[PDB]
Design a protein around this nucleic acid. Structure first.
Ligand SMILES: [Mg+2]
Ligand SMILES: [Mg+2]
Ligand SMILES: [Mg+2]
Ligand SMILES: [Mg+2]
Lengths: 112, 70, 53, 143, 96, 106, 123, 145
RNA sequence: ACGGAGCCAGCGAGUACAACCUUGGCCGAGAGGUCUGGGUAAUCUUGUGAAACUCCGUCGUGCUGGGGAUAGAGCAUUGUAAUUAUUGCUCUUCAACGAGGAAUUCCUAGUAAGCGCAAGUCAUCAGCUUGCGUUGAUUACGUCCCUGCCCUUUGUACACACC
């Protein structure tokens, strides 16, 4: 950075696709669905949609503040420019991935 | 080889006598009279446009057609 | 700890690893992906790459 | 009326320019004449051999007239072509590097070519005069 | 595992400031980012931790991810010293 | 008091078109309210990124291919306007996804 | 009698100079392949082997052969410093014995060993 | 340019360098017929003679042939850059040289011997009568010498 | 075919923590060096003035200047390392092959066929490949003759289903 426009946007898409697959593996218990990464000047809003939102947040900055620092150490960033917001899903049934991880758990746990 | 490549003064004279009053004149049609080879005919075509005698129709490289001066 | 544990692997197949699996076979380096085409093929829609024509 | 360079076709122009150069004989010699390939793919050197280079520099002159600022490589690339590379298929490679440079260096001393800014070479005052006269001379031969 | 113990103490210390660690899956690497040790030795150390309680481990995209649990925070305090009201990433520094 | 025009170029490059075109419409509408001399939303050629790939993992069966490609929409909104009015138009008119960016140096 | 047959050699003159011309003149007096190698960084190519070749010549019985200097580095070229000494060119299996002569001047060690056993049935 | 006037018939072959210079045709391509000369070398030689390449040159002057032959023998004396040659860089520390006739085929057979003496990966493959320059004959060319 | 001369594309792709594309100038027959730039790219490379083409000449239907394989030697370049030629270039070697039997592939329009470019893999290698543009026909515009498939009726001691 500065890099070419065509290489930055592919590295952004990668970055997102790395993050996406991390939060699939890391937030399995929380019932994660998908990320919505906004990149404005200074701050970047990494919004994460999940079912159990209280579990993603933890106890007022605990799991999200672990993960923000992890993202900084992966991709060289500083504190302040990255900011996590864990929101609820507008109707969980409509989202496929939420149901996928529910079906994942129901099988893992023990059910017909 | 099929011969008809050798250059001589006797062959030089026959070409000049075989020049005037000839409809088709080209590299092929000279060689069709068992004459001097392709280029030697092509050179012989070049001499026949020195001072008239045979006048041109086409001008192309290999497609070089000429006709007698009417 | 031992001295000679490294051939000069600046270039070629052995140097260029992928981001995901760690593979030296069918490696997309175009647009600096550094991804084995099979993981790319999985996540292509995530990385912005869509099938149009 | 108004006389111009383009009205004469490029084939007859370069021949008239070549003869014009042979009349002076002050275009200069490079030092590799007929000990030279011309294009890096070309099994046989120039067939005309003696002369030849006068047709070459005439060609570079008229190309530099038509274009804004032509250098060496762009001439090489233009004048290059197809390698009979073997049982493999053909490829494009740029023509001999130096010869085109010796064409340009010689044209600079005569006063055909002038050095241009940014990158390459353009046309002189006295270069444009000979171009137009040679154009006028070939038009008289057609008429 | 055969670690010069000074290098191990630096890794623990560096772990406790962050409360987090982003190690590569890159053995034969001469030195780690931030810490002045080989990457392999950091991974051996974070392998040694994961086994005896602690330390929540992932292995995605050639990057290991290690967060310290409640019992992980207790044992790192025991190794180093620092008694109470300290860094990690369990709570914020001030306002951020 | 200042009125010092630095000549600022705005860079809009993105995948999504209907966002980008709406973003580009929003900046020119702000320029119309603030009433500035500006060149309109210039539209540069779309750099299409073509990753050719065989569909298979194994390299067996028929030899099928997928052109996994990426659309890119490179745009420009050149301003003949001061530094302070650019600081305003950077603060507002920010949408998600589209890469807003400023050159600032003529 | 004066000249023994003809000079066993690289490009011109006789042997007497070959044996005392170290590397630098021998590089200048060679094909492009050897010059390019010397132009690039030399580290561990002439380090351990040449000392053994020099130690082999010093500790020899005189008239008879020196000790066989076994070589992984078959990529080395025959410089004239160690003509006469036998060398074991490594083919994966067997340090295969090659005799360095005054005619093997500026050729690789590898090209005098052959890894595969050549083909039979019909030549 | 000019058709052959005057009696003509000045010898069809024409021997040169213990080899057959073909009558009529051309100097360049009569030179190619000689064992050791090619098209680009022979065109280089014709420049030094100052004979027209358009002419057939089986009706050559004898002094012109003696120039040509001397140009074949001596590269360095005449204006030949000396890496336009058949052989270059050979024996101990000295000079480049080449041949173009019976002298060259003998020189090739001497260099083939030199290869056989050194027993190189090239020279070993010449003994077999096989494929020197690492070319695969798994499929291609099932007849051979 | 070989010389010159004319000389018109499109897809592309390309480095700042590296070593990318690399014009312009000098050296070198080349390959390729070197200084210097411009370019993180409708900006510079790049009109990528690519090839086949078009013009004027050389040879004329001879294993010929067609055809380039095999070879020898050198001169370059990549890389730590090139012999089991990495590739390029130089000169030399001039082999087979005068349109290919039985067979069978692909194809209905900017297509086929020709031509080259291009990225992909890549430090270095293009006969490869996914794209691209140039030149641009022939011949249907049908049929079930073959091949395959599909239904439908029929038969079936089959249902792991004609292995
Ligand atoms: Mg050809
Ligand atoms: Mg461009
Ligand atoms: Mg031949
Ligand atoms: Mg089928």
């Amino acid at each position: 950075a500065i890099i070419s426009k065509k290489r930055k946007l592919v590295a952004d898409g990668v970055f997102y696709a790395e993050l996406n697959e991390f939060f699939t593996r890391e937030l399995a218990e929380e019932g994660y669905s998908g990320v919505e990464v906004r990149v404005t000047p200074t701050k970047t809003e990494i919004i994460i949609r999940a079912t159990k939102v209280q579990d993603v947040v933890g106890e007022n900055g605990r799991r999200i503040n672990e993960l923000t620092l992890l993202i900084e150490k992966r991709f060289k960033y500083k504190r302040g420019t990255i900011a996590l917001y864990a929101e609820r899903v507008h109707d969980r049934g409509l989202s496929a991935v939420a149901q996928a991880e529910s079906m994942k758990f129901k099988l893992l746990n023990g059910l017909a | 080889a099929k011969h008809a490549v050798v250059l001589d003064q006797d062959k030089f004279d026959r070409i000049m006598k075989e020049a005037p009053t000839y409809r088709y004149v080209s590299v092929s049609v000279l060689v069709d009279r068992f004459k001097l080879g392709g280029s030697l005919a092509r050179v012989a075509l070049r001499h026949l446009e020195n001072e008239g005698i045979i006048k041109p129709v086409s001008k192309h490289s290999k497609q070089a057609i000429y006709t007698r001066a009417t | 700890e031992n001295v000679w544990y490294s051939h000069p692997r600046k270039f070629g197949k052995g140097s260029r690893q992928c981001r995901i699996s760690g593979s030296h076979s069918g490696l997309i380096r175009k647009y600096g992906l550094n991804i084995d085409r099979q993981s790319f093929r999985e996540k292509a829609n995530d990385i912005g790459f869509y099938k149009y024509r | 009326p108004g006389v111009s360079v383009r009205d004469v076709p490029a084939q007859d122009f370069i021949n008239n320019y070549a003869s014009f150069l042979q009349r002076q004989g002050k275009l200069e010699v490079p030092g590799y004449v007929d000990i030279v390939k011309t294009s890096a793919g070309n099994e046989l050197p120039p067939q005309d051999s003696e002369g030849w280079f006068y047709k070459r520099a005439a060609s570079v002159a008229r190309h530099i007239y038509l274009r804004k600022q032509v250098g060496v490589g762009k001439l090489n690339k233009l004048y290059g072509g197809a390698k009979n590379r073997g049982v493999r298929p053909h490829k494009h490679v740029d023509a001999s590097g130096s010869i085109n440079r010796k064409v340009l260096q010689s044209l600079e001393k005569l006063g055909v070519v002038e050095i241009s800014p940014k990158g390459g070479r353009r046309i002189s005052d006295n270069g444009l005069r000979d171009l137009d006269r040679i154009a006028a001379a070939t038009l008289e031969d057609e008429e | 595992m055969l670690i010069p113990k000074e290098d191990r103490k630096k890794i623990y210390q560096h772990l406790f400031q962050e409360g987090v660690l982003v190690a590569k899956k890159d053995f034969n690497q001469p030195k780690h980012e931030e810490i002045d040790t080989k990457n392999l030795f950091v991974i051996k150390a974070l392998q040694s931790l994961t086994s005896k309680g602690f330390v929540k481990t992932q292995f995605s995209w050639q990057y290991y991810y290690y967060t310290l649990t409640e019992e992980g925070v207790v044992y790192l305090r025991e190794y180093l010293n620092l008694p109470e009201h300290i860094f990690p990433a369990t709570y914020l520094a001030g306002q951020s | 008091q200042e009125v010092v025009i630095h000549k600022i170029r705005i860079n809009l490059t993105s995948t999504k078109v209907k966002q980008l075109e709406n973003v580009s419409a929003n900046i020119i509408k702000n320029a119309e309210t603030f009433k500035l001399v500006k060149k309109g939303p210039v539209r540069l050629p779309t750099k299409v990124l073509k990753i050719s790939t065989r569909k298979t993992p194994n390299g067996e069966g028929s030899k099928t291919w997928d052109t996994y490609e990426m659309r890119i929409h490179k745009r420009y909104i050149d301003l003949e306007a001061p530094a302070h009015i650019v600081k305003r138009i950077t603060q507002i008119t920010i949408e998600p996804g589209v890469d807003v960016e400023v050159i600032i140096a003529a | 009698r004066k000249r023994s047959f003809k000079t066993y050699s690289y490009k011109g003159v006789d042997l007497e100079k070959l044996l005392e011309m170290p590397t630098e003149d021998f590089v200048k007096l060679a094909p492009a392949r050897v010059r390019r190698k010397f132009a690039r960084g030399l580290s561990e190519k002439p380090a351990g082997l040449m000392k053994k070749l020099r130690a082999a010549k010093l500790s020899a019985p005189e008239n008879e052969k020196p000790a066989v200097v076994r070589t992984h580095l078959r990529n080395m070229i025959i410089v004239p410093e160690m003509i006469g000494s036998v060398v074991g060119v490594y083919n994966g299996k067997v340090f295969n014995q090659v005799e360095i002569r005054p005619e093997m001047v500026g050729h690789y060690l590898g090209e005098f060993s052959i890894t595969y056993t050549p083909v039979r049935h019909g030549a | 340019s000019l058709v052959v006037q005057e009696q003509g018939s000045f010898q069809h072959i024409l021997r040169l360098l213990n080899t057959n210079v073909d009558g009529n045709i051309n100097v360049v391509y009569a030179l190619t017929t000689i064992r050791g000369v090619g098209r680009r070398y022979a065109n280089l030689v014709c420049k030094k003679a100052d004979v027209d390449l358009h002419k057939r040159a089986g009706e050559l002057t004898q002094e012109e042939l003696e120039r040509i032959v001397q140009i074949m023998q001596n590269p360095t004396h005449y204006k030949i850059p000396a890496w336009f040659l058949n052989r270059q860089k050979d024996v101990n520390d000295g000079k480049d040289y080449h041949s173009l006739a019976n002298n060259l085929e003998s020189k090739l057979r001497d260099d083939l011997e030199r290869l056989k003496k050194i027993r190189s990966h090239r020279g070993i493959r010449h003994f077999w009568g096989l494929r020197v320059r690492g070319q695969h004959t798994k499929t291609t060319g099932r007849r051979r010498a």
